[PDB]
Amino acid sequence: LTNLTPTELLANKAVDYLANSFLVETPMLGLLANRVINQKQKAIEWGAKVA
């Protein structure tokens, strides 16, 4: 009522909508992502014919 419904007793249920539309494009990551190699070693050794 004009006074029998205080704000603090009104729940005001929200729409279940979270609004994070942040920068999430990772195309450079997107390229060469599903081919990431998980080594059991910390080093990456490969040869290079330089001459």
Binding site: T2, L9, L10
Partner: peptide, 17 residues
């Protein structure tokens, strides 16, 4: 004698703690 706005009935029907 009291008056209740029809909003206050509905704004606080499923929106009352």
């Amino acid at each position: 004698q009291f008056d209740v706005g029809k909003d206050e009935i509905v704004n606080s029907d499923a929106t009352g703690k």
